[PDB]
């Protein structure tokens, strides 16, 4: 599924991402846009053989196991295939551990290069929330 900006903003607010660890909802929507372009099936393979899955491009060498990434730490103790669902639930759950683990939203490269320091609330204004 390829969410629409406001559609995803709504679905993320419903999963309590708003102000999670103090991160306003705009951050999570902005991160999603430059990570997966809102595509829940997006999967990008990396040079080290690992792959980034889902709406929040979670990596397979550290967060999820996809069965083909040697050394997978699988920190979110979940398969990667579970992150390609139209239901962002699994992704949000994992995304929450990554953040509460002290990594912050820095863990997301796209967030640090395209959202951090900008007026992130622009990403949700004009939305029925």
């Amino acid at each position, epitope marked *: 599924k390829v969410f629409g900006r406001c559609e995803l903003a709504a679905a993320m607010k419903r999963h309590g991402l708003d102000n999670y660890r103090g991160y306003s909802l705009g951050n999570w929507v902005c991160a999603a846009k430059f*990570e997966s372009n809102f595509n829940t099936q997006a999967t*990008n393979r*990396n*040079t*080290d*053989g*690992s792959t*980034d899955y889902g709406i*929040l*491009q*979670i*990596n397979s*060498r*550290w*967060w999820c196991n996809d069965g083909r990434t040697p*050394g997978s*730490r699988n*920190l979110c103790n979940i398969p990667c295939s579970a992150l390609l669902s139209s239901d962002i639930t699994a992704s949000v759950n994992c*995304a929450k551990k*990554i953040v509460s*683990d002290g*990594n*912050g939203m*820095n*863990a*997301w*490269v*796209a967030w640090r290069n395209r959202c951090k320091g900008t007026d992130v609330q622009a990403w949700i204004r004009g939305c029925r929330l």
Partner: nanobody
Framework: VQLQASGGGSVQAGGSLRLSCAAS????????MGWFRQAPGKEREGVAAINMGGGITYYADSVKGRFTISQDNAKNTVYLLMNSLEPEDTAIYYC??????????????????????????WGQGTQVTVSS
């Protein structure tokens, strides 16, 4: 956490040296380990980095082909093999790690060549001196 570096010393131009660095006190990670060097009158230069586990490497243009960095059996220890050392290579070498476990793929050489951004843990510098 603590970074333990060893090796280095003095050597004649053309010789080789091998530095090593041991990260201690990590539950997970580090994600990146690399080396920075500071010579007198010059800017702090990022020399080499590697994505822990994944093994992917990055090198400054000034040491490409001469230096080689590697990991040791995921033992959280990395080595820096320096060949064709020249006196310009004379400097203080620092071992550094990036403790963040990124969600999406991250290339360690990126922060390496942009002020060491992301590398939050540094070790005691080690003097390397290449004489003529």
């Amino acid at each position: 956490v603590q970074l333990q570096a060893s090796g280095g010393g003095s050597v004649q131009a053309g010789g080789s040296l091998r530095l090593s660095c041991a990260a201690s006190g990590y539950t997970i990670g580090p994600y990146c380990m690399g080396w920075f060097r500071q010579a007198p009158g010059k800017e702090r230069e990022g020399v080499a980095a590697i994505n822990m586990g994944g093994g992917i490497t990055y090198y400054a243009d000034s040491v490409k082909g001469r230096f080689t960095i590697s990991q040791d059996n995921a033992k959280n220890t990395v080595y820096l093999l320096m060949n064709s050392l020249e006196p310009e290579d004379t400097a203080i070498y620092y071992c550094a790690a990036d403790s963040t476990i990124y969600a999406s793929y991250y290339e360690c050489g990126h922060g390496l060549s942009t002020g060491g951004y992301g590398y939050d843990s540094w070790g005691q510098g080690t003097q390397v001196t290449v004489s003529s």
